């Protein structure tokens, strides 16, 4: 399993119809300088660390 | 009383234009009154762009999007496509956005 | 009632009156 670690760069805002989902841009600690925006589940502030179970994918808007 | 100087729409110095059928309800309607929209969108989509070039031959190919004109009946143009509704002087704005 | 149905109303009516009067021509 290719585990991938990424630190939260920024809090973009709440997605999802219900709204319990947050858009966040992250930077991987291993091999930095690239940023991907990921959809979270729980509560999130800046400088958290998200474990991305699959390295390259992303999403934007939810219903 | 008269709520539009353009009456319905866009006809002066003619008196008869020819009707088009609405792309939704198939209602007849004059071409000058038509409320028309060009639909330009890729054959592929948001998600399918990556998986396309991946399993496809050629160096990134072309990506030739589809083009067609759309005509609405003002009942359908209000029910879905560009309508909203506007205040007394917001009506007078012909700016596209 | 709608104007144009009221028109068709008296149109019928006039034909029947036209009809009936012919009996006595």
């Amino acid at each position: 399993t290719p585990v991938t670690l990424a630190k939260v760069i920024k809090v973009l805002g709440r997605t999802g119809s219900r709204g319990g989902v947050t858009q966040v841009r992250v930077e991987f600690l291993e091999d930095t300088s690239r940023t991907i925006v990921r959809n979270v589940k729980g509560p999130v502030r800046e400088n958290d660390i998200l474990v991305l179970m699959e390295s390259e994918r992303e999403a934007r808007r939810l219903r | 009383p008269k709520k539009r100087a353009s009456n319905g729409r866009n006809k002066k110095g003619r008196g008869h234009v020819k009707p088009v059928r609405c792309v939704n309800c198939s209602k007849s309607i004059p071409k000058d009154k038509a409320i028309k929209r060009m639909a330009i969108r890729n054959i592929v989509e948001a998600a399918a762009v990556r998986d396309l070039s991946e399993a496809s031959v050629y160096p990134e190919y072309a990506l030739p999007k589809t083009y067609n004109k759309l005509h609405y009946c003002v009942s359908c143009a209000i029910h879905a496509r560009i309508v909203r509704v506007r205040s007394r002087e917001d009506r007078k704005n012909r700016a596209p956005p | 009632m709608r104007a144009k149905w009221r028109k068709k109303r008296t149109r019928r009516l006039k034909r029947k009156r036209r009809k009936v009067r012919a009996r006595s021509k």
């Binding site: - | 072309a62 030739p64 999007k65 589809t66 083009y67 067609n68 | -």
Partner: protein, 214 residues
């Protein structure tokens, strides 16, 4: 419990003489049997391949070509010219608002006698420095251009069958000749040959058909 795949014969398509590559693709028929074999049955059907797949260069990305099969020998079937079309995306693109569209055509014969109708399409262009937003032609303009294109097109055909005609259309010889006579009238961007179709072909003539093969 049949599965015609375990039955069907296979084949491979060979292209005509001058484009780039004569190798095209594959087809499925049936075993050749007495009383309705695989030969006289289908064969001469047609194949539509983009000539940019045929030529290989992508400046040719539009312009589809129809290849009709004629004769067959030994798991090799050679084809010829059934016509030429345009890609819908290109045409639907070239057509833009705020400008004048101009089309014309002619029915015309050739040496080895192939009757055909070629089309033409051209749009007016703005001139650099032009302030007004549309740039429409004068309808007297339009009639003349149609006449000249008609004048030009009638000459190019009837030279040497479709053979040299094929050779003529490919590197856009006509497109510029139009543009040359045209410029004395109106600016006119685009200007391609668009569609060309065939209607009446001559007799088979097994000999002349093989002139493109080797």
């Amino acid at each position: 419990v049949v599965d015609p795949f375990t039955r069907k014969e296979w084949f491979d398509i060979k292209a005509p003489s001058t484009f780039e590559n004569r190798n095209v693709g594959k087809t499925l028929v049936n075993k050749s049997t007495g009383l309705k074999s695989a030969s006289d049955a289908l064969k001469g059907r047609v194949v539509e391949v983009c000539l940019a797949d045929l030529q290989g260069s992508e400046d040719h990305s539009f312009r589809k070509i129809k290849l009709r099969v004629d004769e067959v020998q030994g798991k090799n079937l050679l084809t010829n010219f059934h016509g030429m079309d345009f890609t819908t995306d290109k045409l639907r693109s070239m057509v833009r608002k705020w400008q004048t569209l101009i089309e014309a055509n002619v029915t015309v014969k050739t040496s080895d006698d192939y009757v055909l109708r070629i089309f033409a399409i051209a749009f007016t262009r703005k001139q650099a420095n032009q302030v007004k937003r549309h740039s429409y032609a004068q309808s007297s303009h339009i009639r003349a251009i149609r006449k000249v294109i008609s004048e030009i097109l009638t000459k190019e055909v009837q030279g040497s069958t479709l053979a040299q005609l094929t050779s003529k259309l490919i590197p856009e010889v006509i497109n510029k000749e139009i543009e040359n006579a045209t410029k004395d009238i109106f600016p006119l961007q685009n200007i391609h040959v668009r569609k060309v179709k065939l209607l009446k072909q001559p007799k088979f003539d097994v000999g002349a058909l093989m002139a493109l093969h080797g």
